[PDB]
């Protein structure tokens, strides 16, 4: 019953990106695909809008001639596409589907935005992506342990990462990954893990950086 | 252009209590107002469409109110899981405009950070860097303060920090303060520190680890 969207891609200034929206379950009654973005820590700003049932289009002019929204009746999917990209477009974008109009009015319908998809971040930079080196955040100590994962020097975000593939959550916190110096991202994951667990349970921290597709598998033991 | 300020921007109300979020339109969108909360990282969720008339699956803590040029989402009694921003929108005429949000943090009881120190990885010093690690995990208020001592002189300027989103269980943070050196600079120094001071923990706390 939930939206999907294409992976996190990066451009270069002047390029053009194209996201979709593949339906998982089928189709379902909707009258409308919109995009909304959400730059790095902002709020959400509505860039355009399909409404079949009338056959017309809105947008913002932030975007005027520059976005094509596309909305296949079949596949109950939508490709979109930004053309002419500034670093200032550099956000999330998000699939959204309304399933009832509130309001028609100039050739347009108007609501709800009852579903919405998971988030694709797209970069716009002239810099070069570099995928990330992971090392360990080792333990040592008698009661809860902390061991942990160290992300530098990547380029694009964003980075993925989980334990034991996916089967360790709780007591798992990720860092925001923070801008370095260098111009290359850094983060940290850590993860709360009683003393005596050390020695026989295996600790692996996985992290994807699909802008570059290199996923790295590292295993954190303490240290001799 | 219609502009709608989302007032007040930053809250924090105690568990059970009531949070109230008010939205005000510049030129009357009357009743064509949506309610979206955004839970970290996650998507946003409907809650509110129309003025006031809840979204399908929503409990009914959240209620909204108002018409015009005025607006109002209160939610009572709340959970550990209703921190989040919460974003206003208006659909009365095209461009489709949001307000900038309403962070809501969820107080709790006082707690200590739990502190660790983490010695750079003999893999990442064969490049030519080094990072230290120092993680305050699972504690609360968010303001704290993390030192760096080294050689035991206090370091500035070669650190940076980040801090997760409120936990939606504990309502917990959790901090990372990370110290940068050059492979030499980190092998002439012997002793490294982190200093932690917090409104939780009656005195300063501080890790540290001599090199080998």
């Known amino acids: 019953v939930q939206l999907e969207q294409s992976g996190a891609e990066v451009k270069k200034p002047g390029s053009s990106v194209k996201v979709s929206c593949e339906t998982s379950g089928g189709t379902f009654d909707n009258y409308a695909l919109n995009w909304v973005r959400q730059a790095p820590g902002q709020g959400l700003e509505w860039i355009g809008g399909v409404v079949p049932l009338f056959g017309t289009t809105r947008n913002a002019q932030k975007f005027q001639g520059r976005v094509t929204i596309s909305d296949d009746k079949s596949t109950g999917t939508g490709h979109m596409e930004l053309r002419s990209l500034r670093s200032e477009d550099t956000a999330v974008y998000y699939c959204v589907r309304s399933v009832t109009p509130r309001y028609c009015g100039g050739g347009f319908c108007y609501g709800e935005f009852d579903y919405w998809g998971q988030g694709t971040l797209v970069t716009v930079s002239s810099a070069s992506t570099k995928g990330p080196s992971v090392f360990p955040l080792a333990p040592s100590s008698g009661g809860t342990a902390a061991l942990g994962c160290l992300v530098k020097d990547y380029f694009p975000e964003p980075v993925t990462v989980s334990w034991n593939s996916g089967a360790l959550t709780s007591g798992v916190h990720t860092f925001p990954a923070v801008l370095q110096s260098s111009g290359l991202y850094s983060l940290s994951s850590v993860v709360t893990v009683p003393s005596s667990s050390l020695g026989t349970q295996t600790y692996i921290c996985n992290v994807n950086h699909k802008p570059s597709n290199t996923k790295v598998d590292k295993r954190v033991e303490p240290k001799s | 252009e219609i502009e709608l300020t989302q007032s007040p921007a930053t809250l924090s109300v105690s568990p059970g209590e009531r949070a109230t979020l008010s939205c005000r339109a510049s030129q009357s969108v009357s009743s064509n107002l949506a309610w979206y909360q955004q839970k970290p990282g996650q998507a946003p969720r409907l809650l509110i469409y129309?003025?006031?008339t809840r979204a399908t699956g929503i409990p009914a803590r959240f209620s909204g109110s108002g018409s015009g040029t005025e607006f109002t989402l209160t939610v009572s009694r709340l959970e550990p899981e209703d921190s989040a921003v919460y974003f206003c929108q208006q659909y009365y005429r095209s461009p489709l405009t949001f307000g900038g949000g309403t962070k809501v943090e969820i107080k709790r009881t006082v707690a200590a950070p739990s502190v660790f120190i983490f010695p750079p990885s003999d893999e990442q010093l064969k490049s030519g860097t080094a990072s230290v690690v120092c993680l305050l995990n699972n504690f609360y208020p968010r303001e704290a303060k993390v030192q760096w001592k080294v050689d035991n002189a206090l370091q500035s300027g070669n650190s940076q920090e980040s801090v997760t989103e409120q936990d939606s269980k504990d309502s917990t943070y959790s901090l990372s303060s990370t110290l940068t050196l050059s492979k030499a600079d980190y092998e002439k120094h012997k002793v490294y520190a982190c200093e932690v001071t917090h409104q939780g923990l009656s005195s300063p706390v501080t890790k540290s680890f001599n090199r080998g």
């Open positions: 129309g003025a006031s």
